[PDB]
Amino acid sequence: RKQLATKAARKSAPATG
Amino acid sequence: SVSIYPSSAEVLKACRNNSSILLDKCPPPRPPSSPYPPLPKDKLNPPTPSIYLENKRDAFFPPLHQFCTNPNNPVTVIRGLAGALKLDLGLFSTKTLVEANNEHMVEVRTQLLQPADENWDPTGTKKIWHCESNRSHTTIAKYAQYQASSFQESLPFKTIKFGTNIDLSDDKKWKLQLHELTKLPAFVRVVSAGNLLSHVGHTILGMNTVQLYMKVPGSRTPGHQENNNFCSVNINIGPGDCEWFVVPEGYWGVLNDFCEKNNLNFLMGSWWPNLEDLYEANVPVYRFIQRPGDLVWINAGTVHWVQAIGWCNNIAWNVGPLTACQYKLAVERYEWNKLQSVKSIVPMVHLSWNMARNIKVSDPKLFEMIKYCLLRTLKQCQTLREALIAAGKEIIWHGRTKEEPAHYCSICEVEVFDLLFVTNESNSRKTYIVHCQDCARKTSGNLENFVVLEQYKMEDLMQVYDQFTLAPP
Ligand SMILES: O=C(O)CNC(=O)C(=O)O
Ligand SMILES: [Cl-]
Ligand SMILES: [Cl-]
Ligand code: NI
Ligand SMILES: [Zn+2]
């Protein structure tokens, strides 16, 4: 069964650098 | 009992080519103009809706739930919540957390210590909206030393560090912490049958799992609405206080315009409103102090920003009441996010289908909104499926595993429901990258190097759709 790349959905704060 | 929606069989036969079943074209989401009627200056500093708990029974008083979700109340502060429930806030003290998981990952924001409720450019020349907040990472042990030693030192701007969005998601690592939170009334619990986010079926970190904040004075969370406009629950652990600034959902268009005018992105940017600008624009601002043990409920779509006044920790997560208002605002933001190329971390299509599987909905307005979403997406899926077969493009059964997350387009970040367009990751024959239909076709006109995976049996979706009917009250 094909393996799909994924990223963990996550709440996070803005960043400016 | 009147049905206004076609059956799944009728939807399917419509897609197989005469008359239309629905418009399908829809006014594009947009930011609201300043609310009408305008508020006079004497109404721009309203008191915060408050609940004063004394006894455990007070917290489980049913009307409390309805007070918090009332759309006219943008925020509710529930005073004395920890004390009423006899919650052991000590389980979330810096000392206790470090002892539990000394090496735990802590994301950090480094910021300038700004005076009062203001935000000045680094030279201290002029107030600006841009909020300098730079990312780094540390351990809970190291941030703890910084916080604790800070609390000793105290007793043209300084730099401070803020431990933020620390994930307390692992029940093995935080067993006692998380068990303590099951003492809460159902409507603010991280997990409950009445919480839409408990029907997602997979983890969204910080939304349906707990996040911790470790703060020193001046630590700021800049202006935002929650992801997909879900309500937020926040408990201050202490020992110090936090100050909250809140603007009603209806003014989010006005704040959006302020951001743009200050060359900042409303949805993704880092911005700290100038209260004097808001006052001149007749935007009302609720402002209050959250003490240790006080719970803050941020209603759906409420715009807010926060700063620590003392040294303290907070814990927080999202909840989604089973209401037309919450569902409407979540869908609106999902659609606006698409237009803005911003990822919705709540996969509203995936979620709506789970809601349809799991929840008997008795409110006609909410029922109609959900079924309308099912209709639009069922039609989109069948239409695409028919097109692909007409093109002789094969559809490979992929299915879903228990708890599998919703997938998103690696390019535009839109949720990709049911039919996944996948092509190999660079230099890999093992790993595949999900694309939406549009993005797949712009890489390959005819989908040459793409495979189409199907996650749900169409017969399954058709059944869920047909079985989703208005429940009796
Ligand atoms: O605690 C903070 O600094 C930020 N918290 C929130 O924005 C929230 O709980 O919704
Ligand atoms: Cl429950
Ligand atoms: Cl599942
Ligand atoms: Ni928030
Ligand atoms: Zn895409």
The finding on whether B298 has its CB within 6 A of some atom of ligand 1 is yes
What is the rounded distance in angstroms from the CA atom of residue B289 to the CA atom of residue B284? 17
**Residue type at B203?**
T
Return d(Cα B178, Cα B352) in angstroms, integer: 27
Half-sphere exposure in the Cβ direction for B87 (13 Å, CA): 29
Closest CA to B119 of B259, B221, B271, B224: B271
3-state helix, strand, coil in chain B (%, to 5): 35, 25, 45
Report yes or no: B371 and B357 within 8 Å, Cβ to Cβ. Answer: no
Inter-residue contact B432 to B422 (CB < 8 Å): yes
Distances (CA, A) of B448 to B391, B394, B430, B433, B451: 12, 11, 18, 15, 8
> How many C-beta atoms lie closer than 10 Å to residue B117's C-beta?
15
CA distance A8 to chain B (A): 7
One-letter amino acid of B450:
F
What CATH number is given for B1-16+324-390+458-473 in this structure?
Answer: 1.20.58.1370
**Token pair listed for B82:** 């920890």
Question: Which of B379, B419, B428 has the alpha carbon at shortest distance from B399?
Answer: B419
Q: What angle in degrees, to the nearest 10, is found between the helix axes of B8-15 and B364-390?
A: 40
The residue assigned the tokens 């935007």 is B283
Q: Is B94 exposed, middle or buried (0-12, 13-18, 19+ CB in 10 A)?
A: buried
Distance (Å, whole) CA B218 – CA B162 = 9
Distances from the Cα of B472 to the Cα of B136, B169, B181, B359, B371, angstroms: 52, 36, 32, 12, 16
Query: What residues pair up with B434 in beta bridges, in sequence order?
Result: B422
Closest ligand 1 atom to residue B213 Cα is 1
Among B61, B22, B66, CA closest to B325: B66
Tell me how close the Cα of B223 comes to any Cα of chain A, in angstroms.
9
Please state the length of chain A: 17
At residue B32, what are phi and psi to the nearest 5 degrees?
Answer: -65, 150
What residues are paired with B51 via a beta bridge?
B78
Spatial separation of the C-alpha atoms in residues B60 and A13, rounded to whole Å: 32
* B164 within ligand 1 shell (Cβ under 6 A): no
Ligand 1 atom at minimal distance to the Cα of residue B308: 3
> B292 — contact with chain A (CB < 8 Å)?
no
- In angstroms, the CA B377 to CA B372 distance is 9
**CB contact, 8 Å: B135 with chain A?**
yes
Alpha-carbon distance values, B184 to B8, B97, B452 (Å): 41, 20, 45
Instruction: Give the experimental resolution in Å.
Output: 1.8
**B140: helix, strand or coil:** helix
B119-144 b/e (C-beta count within 10 Å ≥ 16 → b): bbeeeeeeebbbbbbeeeebbbbbbb
**Ligand 5 centre from B435 Cα, in Å?**
5
Rounded to a whole number, what is the distance in Å from the CA of B9 to chain A's nearest CA? 31
Written as six digits, the tokens of A5 are 């790349």
Instruction: Decide if B192 contacts B234 (C-beta within 8 A).
Output: no
- SS (HEC) of B149-206: HHHHHCCCCCEEEEEEEEECCCCCCCHHHHHHHHHCCHHHCCCCCCCHHHHCCCCCEC
A3 forms bridges with which residues in the sheet?
B431
Query: B17-323: which CATH architecture?
Result: Sandwich (2.60)
Chain breaks in chain B (C to N over 2.5 A) after: 17, 155
Distance B234 CA to ligand 1 centre (A): 7
Facing A6 at nearest CB: one of B135, B204, B405 = B405
| CB within 8 Å: A4 and B133 | no
Residue B467 to residue B156: CA distance in whole angstroms: 64
Would you call B281 an interface residue with chain A, using a CB distance cutoff of 8 Å?
no
Q: Does domain B391-457 have CATH number 2.60.34.10?
A: no
CB within 8 Å of chain A, chain B residues 53-82 = none
Task: Please state, in angstroms and rounded to a whole number, the distance separating the CA atoms of residues B325 and B64.
Answer: 17
Q: Where are the domains of chain B?
A: 1-16+324-390+458-473, 17-323, 391-457
* Residue B201 structure tokens: 């079926």
By DSSP bridging, strand B159-167 and strand B395-397 are: unpaired
In B203-293, the DSSP E strands lie at 211-215, 220-224, 231-239, 242-247, 286-290
Phi-psi region of B468 (alpha: psi -120 to 50; beta: other; left: phi over 0): beta
B226 annotated as a binding-site residue = yes
Four-residue CA torsion sign, B53, B219, B301, B36: positive
Question: Residue B17 has which token pair?
Answer: 């080519």
Is residue B428 classed exposed, middle or buried when 0-12, 13-18 and 19+ CB atoms within 10 A define those classes? exposed
Question: From its phi and psi, is residue B16 left (phi > 0), alpha (psi between -120 and 50) or beta?
Answer: alpha
